[PDB]
Design a protein around this ligand. Structure first.
Ligand SMILES: *[C@@H](C(=O)OCC)[C@H](O)C(=O)N[C@@H](CC(C)C)C(=O)NCCC(C)C
Length: 212
């Protein structure tokens, strides 16, 4: 795998989104990985529905939080609609996936990266954008403006985001806090520190969709 990866340069990343006050990050992270793998497999970059996962993932909890793995399982089992078809509303509502016609895209499964293993995550990101979790509660992270973030942060992961690239000393993260946070909505988090958890627990729980 290469020394630099940046799925934005390969046209596999849609514009940065803002989840608002709703605890819907698990869905934004999952959707990022679906947008990426659909671009990788088909050549088309589309936006897919975070709102659909909020409403329809019966194993997540809407705006009270959820599981990127559960949302990716849902996209593999049923599918997902285009964002413009099922736009983000910032509130959980009833599942409307049936009333909106056929699903726009569908995947074939979901994998987990070996946890607490930096190289396994780098391999996965070299293949595609990956759903990852981290500790975002620390004000150092909340207030991040740019540069390669080294912390301070603990391993108390509470926030799902998406890894869309990496470099020698960092992993490139698409956050769901709008384009005004960090580096136009992105954060570069230092890697290679030898702490198995990753900076801010970045290696705790990483999933990606499978699409043949
Ligand atoms: C993420 C979010 O939107 O926070 C941004 C301010 C949610 O709080 C969330 O779903 N967190 C998630 C942690 C990752 C996805 C493992 C979580 O705790 N999910 C379990 C659901 C419930 C027990 C909170």
């Amino acid at each position: 795998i290469p020394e630099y990866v940046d799925w934005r340069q390969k046209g596999a990343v849609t514009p940065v989104k803002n989840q608002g006050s709703c605890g819907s990050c698990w869905a934004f992270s999952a959707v990022v990985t679906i947008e990426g793998i659909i671009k990788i497999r088909t050549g088309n970059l589309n936006e897919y529905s975070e709102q659909e996962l909020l409403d329809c993932d019966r194993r997540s909890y809407g705006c009270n939080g959820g599981y990127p793995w559960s949302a990716l399982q849902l996209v593999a089992q049923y599918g997902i609609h285009y964002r413009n078809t099922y736009p983000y509303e910032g509130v959980q509502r009833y599942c409307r996936s049936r009333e909106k016609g056929p699903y726009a895209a569908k995947t074939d499964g979901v994998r987990q990266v070996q946890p607490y293993n930096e190289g396994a995550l780098l391999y996965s990101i070299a293949n595609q954008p990956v759903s990852v979790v981290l500790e975002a509660a620390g004000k150092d992270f909340q207030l991040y403006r740019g540069g390669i973030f080294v912390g301070p942060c603990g391993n108390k992961v509470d926030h799902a985001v998406a890894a869309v690239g990496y470099g020698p000393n960092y992993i490139l993260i698409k956050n769901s806090w709008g384009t005004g946070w960090g580096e136009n909505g992105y954060i570069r988090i230092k890697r290679g520190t030898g702490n198995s958890y990753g900076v801010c627990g970045l290696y705790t729980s990483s999933f990606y969709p499978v699409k043949n």
